[PDB]
């Protein structure tokens, strides 16, 4: 039962391989903050031997008001990914909402993300399947692990088979997320052993709890980990979804590699019988 | 505490008024089936004294595969609403996905629907607020009743205050919906007493159970009821979301008016103290 | 599909019959308050043509601290049921925890209640099946409607078939209950059409919301309704589980009979096909 | 923030200490199977350097029918714990239902367990607080982590402060459990840093999934792990709650110690700021 590998450049993402980091920041506030954030990742990733794909959003469609911070935009934003790639030479992942945005970005970046709310948007899977780029499918909180067969299948059809699944937790009554550790196996199984990644930040909201959560995730064994940081977490340890104090990256990423390695090399165990 | 009224033509939708029906069919399969479906509504509505707004979808973005039945389309579909309005003289409600579709439809139809998955899509609320049309906001299964303040507020901002809220149940573990009867009061309260409607069909999936559910809903007291029917329910009593056997409309709508009336005229009761 | 009837004296409890009230108070604080509470029920029940079974607890095992108000006790409590029966001539229902309490009470009272937490306690079902009394099984928040087959079956075995099921809601994430209106049909079906009753008070906790909830329940159509009141609801409209302001009984019970009747006589509808 | 330690003989149970195993079997089927089961534990525990407390139930009150296998019984069962202690010299933990059973067992055994369904039974906490024995409180699926303050407090009152908390998952819609990894921190915090243990077997039901689950649990860092095994898992890898194939103990317990150690020694990390 050998794992499907998804390769973002030299980067080999798979559930049996050493874990990839899709770290970064929520939005592209400024380049000035983008570059400083990307700095700490690349330095600490490269030091600690952790494959790295940078992540920031150029657009927002989940603002609370209309006359809020949309963000850079499709046009202004892609230049800031040009200027980061050359300066640091890392792979960039960003979310895409409108179908028309799909091709523009697949050129600029390496991994495109399918936001959870739009996971069941065939108009967007169609148009994002076209690009031929590596897809990150965020697993909707309101969709069960087994239902992720259909979204991978829809991608297959559109031609694109370079797909990652990202668990960002599941609705647990009102205004609460829980992470179903069992979900990861089910998403692997139903996905032709596609790479599963745990979006630990977006699986929190209602902390010190980033740590304990992401360990548990990694101890299952995953292809990668999706995290967001901030130098001063919007002030509160949580910029909307719970952002990690940038400073604490290394001693945290220490803990994750330590588990990912201890776990990834394990006399394959079958409690089945 | 007098209710906010939303008027679709002569039709006055409000939580204290006699209940409006937003009945119809899932997709516009053919006009031949559209018109026959619309027939039974108009005849039974008009007989039974139930304000009526017809509902069918022109587009689908919730297909399971890409090379599936998209449906009529934005262009072919709107003609079939022209040809229904003149022939039957009823108000048409349809869902809208892409932001560009918003203005085209607000002309053709009376009520536009904001699909649950895209409820947190500011690009679409913005563009749908513009039209100035009556909005039906489907309440996401993964969003709590109190959170519906923000979506009504976002609509206010964009200029549009002619907004209905539609409960289509809430995620209850994996692959299961429950309807929180308490939700209706909370959505009223937080919405400036906006009209709340119960999408009974879309709150089912995993029946004979359409009946018992929609009673319970109506006994709370609601502005309206959102239902879909079929002559032969795709064969199974459930065309995706659980469709009502068209024949059983009258003896069912009998039951709903009977509750809506008994309830709507009630020495206002305060169990608060 | 004629309903199983359960007869508490002259009182005929069944899902097709006019609805029975199992109204009352949480604990037997004093007789002085017991009798005053029982007064308002009997007067308003008898006025309004609503079969009535009084309910109060003699014991508590759900106190928050040990050195709290246990309540009257097995010995002191049963005398206060003697003194209520003679004075008012109504049927008394009380909960039972220890297996040894089962026989003592089945003599003193008419209906014994199986508390939710102990629903899966064979030692207690065995001993409560023995009595031959009418059982009220509270449906655990953590047990699904279909699982109520097994508890009715366990009762059958022990000899006792005079069993009512009481829905008191279901766990909905942390520290939250939801009532699944669909549950009532499933509990009927799996229970040999046993009488289902809705414990509206105990299905609330986290109100004005008693009203809207109990309507919805009744509009499904039920054998009965389980409620608790207080003259001054411990001060807050909610003595632990949300207690109804005693004064508002009539104008509330007005609303319930009005639905129970409108519903109970209904050209039986099959949305199944 | 040093951890509260609970000492079962020489055995020191605490969230910072190396993890204790509360392994064993569901019921005492026969001594012949009891002793063979206990054999494999003691051999593999002792080999692998894992503190061990054996667990089996003498009684069952969660049978599906009345005329089912009650089990050994309070009298016949305690002799089989005598005969295991002497032969193997390990600490025995068993569940207790009736209040009268509490003192008898606290003599025979080292750790008594408070079953989840009876966690809110003051009559049993009172009587189990008396014994002065080490308590294992199973955390009800229908009770949230923060609510575990009250049960520890109730134990304090009755005199007994030698209390362990055991997470056995939480209700996740109908007939489904999820384990909230975040729960462990909250139960620690609210419990005066009491020892938290993860009942991995009882957190499954609806497997190969025992493995992935218990890793995740341990990677959080816990005082101990509660598991049940069988030579031939009732035939299916799951004797009611999902039992572990006895043979696979070592290569599984290998994995758990490997995480417990890697985790337990960790430059304490604060993602809080």
Author numbering:
A (entry chain A), B (entry chain A), C (entry chain A), D (entry chain A): 1 to 206, 218 to 284
Study authors write:
The SFX structure of KDO8PS was solved based on all collected data where droplet formation was confirmed via the in-line droplet detector. The mean of unit cell constant distributions were calculated to be a = b = c = 118.4 Å and α = β = γ = 90° by cell_explorer, part of the CrystFEL package. Of the 37,000 patterns classified as hits, 16,777 could be indexed and 15,777 patterns were included in the final set of merged reflections (1000 patterns were rejected by partialator during the merging) and used for structure determination. Furthermore, the structures reported by both Radaev et al. and Vainer et al. have a missing, unstructured loop region (residues AA-206 to AA-217), which is believed to be part of the active site of the protein. In the structure presented here, residue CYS-206 showed clear electron density and was therefore included in the model. The electron density revealed differing detail compared to previously-reported KDO8PS structures determined at cryogenic temperatures, such as the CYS-206 residue and a different loop conformation in the residue range 246–251.
It is based on the generation of sub-nL crystal suspension droplets embedded in an immiscible oil, allowing injection with a traditional GDVN. The determined structure revealed new detail in a previously undefined loop region of KDO8PS, a potential target for antibiotic studies.
